[PDB]
Symmetry: C3
Amino acid sequence: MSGQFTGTGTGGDVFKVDLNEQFDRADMVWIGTASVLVWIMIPGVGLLYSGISRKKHALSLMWAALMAACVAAFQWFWWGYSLVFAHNGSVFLGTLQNFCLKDVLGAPSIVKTVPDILFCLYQGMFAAVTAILMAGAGCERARLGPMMVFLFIWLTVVYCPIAYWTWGGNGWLVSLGALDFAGGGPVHENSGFAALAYSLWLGKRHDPVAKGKVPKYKPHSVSSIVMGTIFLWFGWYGFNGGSTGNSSMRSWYACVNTNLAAATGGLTWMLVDWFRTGGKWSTVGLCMGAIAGLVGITPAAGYVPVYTSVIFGIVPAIICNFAVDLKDLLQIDDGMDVWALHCVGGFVGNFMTGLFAADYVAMIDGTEIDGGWMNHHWKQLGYQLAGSCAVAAWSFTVTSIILLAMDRIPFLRIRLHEDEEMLGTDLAQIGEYAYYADDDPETNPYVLEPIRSTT
Amino acid sequence: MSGQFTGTGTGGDVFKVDLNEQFDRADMVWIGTASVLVWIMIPGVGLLYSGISRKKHALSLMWAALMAACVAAFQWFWWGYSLVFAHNGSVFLGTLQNFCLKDVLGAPSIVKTVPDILFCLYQGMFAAVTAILMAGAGCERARLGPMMVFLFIWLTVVYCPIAYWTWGGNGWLVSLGALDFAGGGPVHENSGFAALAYSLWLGKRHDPVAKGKVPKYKPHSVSSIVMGTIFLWFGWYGFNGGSTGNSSMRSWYACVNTNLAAATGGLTWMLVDWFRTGGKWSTVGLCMGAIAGLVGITPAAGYVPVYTSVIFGIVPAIICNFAVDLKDLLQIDDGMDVWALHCVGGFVGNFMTGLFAADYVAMIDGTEIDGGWMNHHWKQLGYQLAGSCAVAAWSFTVTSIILLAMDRIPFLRIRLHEDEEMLGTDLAQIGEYAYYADDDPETNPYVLEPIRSTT
Amino acid sequence: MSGQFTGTGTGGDVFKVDLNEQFDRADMVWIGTASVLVWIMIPGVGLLYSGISRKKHALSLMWAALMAACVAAFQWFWWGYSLVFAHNGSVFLGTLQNFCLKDVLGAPSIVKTVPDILFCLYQGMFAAVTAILMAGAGCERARLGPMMVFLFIWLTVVYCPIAYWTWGGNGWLVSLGALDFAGGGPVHENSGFAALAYSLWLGKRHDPVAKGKVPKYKPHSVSSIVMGTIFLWFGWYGFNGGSTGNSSMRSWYACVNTNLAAATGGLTWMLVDWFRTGGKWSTVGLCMGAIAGLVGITPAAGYVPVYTSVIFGIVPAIICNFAVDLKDLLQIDDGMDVWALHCVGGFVGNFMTGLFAADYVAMIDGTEIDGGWMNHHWKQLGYQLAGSCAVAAWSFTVTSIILLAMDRIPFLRIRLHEDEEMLGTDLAQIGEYAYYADDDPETNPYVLEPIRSTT
């Protein structure tokens, strides 16, 4: 019990040492602020995907964002933080050393400029953003109980390993040399490939909104799309700007890159839509392009020269705009918008990080990297591809397994089969289920949950 | 006129000393940021209580939140800050030493890590949040002029004394040893018991929405409930996280506790509703439970171990969920939602702080406390109860007096009696009052103020 | 290549020096946070002017705020930052030294407490707020392509010179001694006089909403007005609080002044409306008065004693409230709300800064000024008037030239003449333009762009 700084456990005895002395207070303030900013991205995701939908979802994703904030916070506390950021992990996962945040306090975190407790706060927001991306992707005819269980399991066995490989103290992707500045792999590529697994296993096939001569854009609520894009772009300054872990000017450089990629992505997607529609101005397109650029710059924001951030707007916006068209070749809508922006945007950004990463940008705050093709470090592109392939293999395969194992268990089935659920119009004709008469989630105090036509 | 640091008055002469040298700049930045975050809780309250209402209020609480931000800011400047945070107070109140913020500048505040001027900014937001809680509680058939006068008086003679006892330099509750980390007494218990006084003296009796077989949840606007809950949870990181007064990791520890209590409160209330309705998922319940947990953890966030923060979600959510049922036993709706979340949630949290407060949590930033039952400091629970009883006696009794003294004065009567006001439908039939035809506050440029049927 | 700190170029070689050593990290964190806060004012402007409109605009200003965020960010990167904040400017403009942010990194900025890259982030938000004020002012029957080109040109040749005179390293207004704390000239007076140029050249004359016995207030969406006012007041803490460039308590003093001016402006405008309507409570008026006070205090917030901030609420709210009446004398509505709040509010605030500026307020963080009439520095009022006259002459004249040169070019004409555009109801009857049937921007994926009746 000398209690001096150990770098392990709680970091020392608060009655004997001031744990705050190990950290620059301004670093801590910025990462605390950035945590608050990432938190508001959670309802941003909900608003965005609620608004863009071409189908009336029975579950309101604006409200489901709060449900996801609750489920993710509890999972992170319970063991999610420990599985990613315990200090004694393997190369593929952490441990249960910090179960229920036991001994999470003032030791320097995997990011040594902030203590464990603050790194826990910040990184837990990333877990929550990914949870609402997953709830958004799988929200069509979802049952709420099974969805909450799914999110808990999916965070534990899909998010946490991929996050560990990317960020953990011994993560194998970190060792390989792959670059991922703000977690494009664990957040965007991961949620995107998981969305794809949902689309192909549980999504509706031959979907009327994706079949024949149907509009590409047919939004539920433009004002929801816009409000979600506002919260997402506002919060993304914390998402990317805080991923330095410090108050250095690399944080602000990352913010300039973030803003410029969002801006160029928005204008690019709208310009592509203008060419492809023969002169129309796409309100949905401007918002999706801003998100495409934000996703695109996420792996790169603290590594690439400011002038290259425009390419992280332009190229993801172009490729994602055409990716959305694959919904019509497959005739599937469910889950595919999250796949198109986050999987395809995240893959493109991760790949381009291997091209444009620069050692002199990372060195703005002393961070040492070999760099990308900008430094003729040709091997970097293969490290990026190794990262993307690992994320895709794990996220798609394990998400498929979870969805299908729950589908075979009757009370955990996330989405009832079409032949077993009752119609809201016929439920409204029953007295013990009369509240389905109100099919508008603005005055209804109850979720219009799918009901098995066996009761 | 040597102007060196005195700790009194302006703190020194700006032409001779740098007043900023007394403070850690990172402490100041966090409390400045947290002030901005608490500010957005003001419209959060308005949105939440506007949306949850089972009655169409003529006054829009989203808009009334801005009115309350204006009235509270002026009252705080005029003498509210001085009555709580003057440096020469008694044990029950401050003074008028800082009338119109005279000499409020660079002396270390009652919280010595920030200067008076910044502490004034931060604490004034708490006064404003309490003002909109009070306007929300008393908004049914309120007359706007009288309401603005009421809020000014109520802040001066109810909020400011209770805040002084809790936070002031010589406040008697501080001396007793009562713990109240982020102002659960002055903000939540206070507004809650004042709401109760409104309910029992001015609220409608035998209210059709609270009588017989009526729905417990019947919201005006679910999207308003959700947007309000978003702003409240986002801002609460400043409300609780800033209540350390510093940039230490106790601030971030308080944020982790805040997030986990909100999350567990939301899931608990929804689970209780699911059991009590026989299988329904309550969209209103999830939001009210998040607020219950946020209120519950407010007195405790910087004092309790992280694993106990889940109890500050669970137990307030359970007890508050049943408290809302008392609206049906009394057959009163007006004011009772604010009472149920803030009085009952604040009382439960204050009580549980005496159980779970821990000296090693407070000591994260050097703060010295005897602790709670966690440290077998058994007397702490009685100090907490002394605090709650003082708040309840003062807030309920003095709020009752104000409401009844204004009720007896004809131009200050806050709520016209049912027999003396004219119906909006009959006002619409008069030309000098034709604008009451529009009973929807979305296109109407005028408040649909109650009009005495004597003109 | 010694790479030590030069104060020029990139500021030094990142491989040889730590550029962050030149700056207080807490200063950087506050200005980074304040940048994020100013960003959300961009959609705040859009919401406010969308909601207040007495006419149904075909272009949604909430959505157009994102378009403006994109166009302004790209212009700032391309050459806007360089034209204002290059380190080698003349007295009237900067240069293209920092084209595409070349060499923008760690040299101390024109504001020496933050590096170029962070000053670029922060000041670029001001450029974007001004862009959405301009898009709001000119939004009636705007064509989106021409508007985007107009904003790019207008930022380059109107905003950037005026910003340079106000803020640039050799700006002539700075040399004269004019005071403008947070950019009331470049943001508010500038956008306001440019709006006036739009009103008088492109606005509709003899407008039915401004002719005869018509309501002064007749809003499109009160909830939009309120949400915009919320985002604007929340973000204005960064707008004014960050304009110190540091973490000193002058930042927090500026925030107290900002809040009190907003509060007193809101209550004053509502009280004026109450007297002028004979007893009505104006929901629009409370919001416009808060904005009037925010605009009014912008040039003054870091220079005037706290008790005088109430005059920056009261007097702008009174004068602006009567200015709005000039819409009825001219019978023009288009562009005039932005003129009335930002030109008239900004002029009044700039003038009153010469009266109330105090050397002891500026000296809170070491800033040295002669002061205003408060210091019997009588000449200060003439320096303020010189500033306002220069802004008005440049903004009005050059904006007029741009609008008229584009008007004469057929594919750049911003607003089609009434005789050449087709009616949305007749477009809806054509198949290649059928989407004009939906005249509500909430479900329509396409901007209802004006179409020449020649195709």
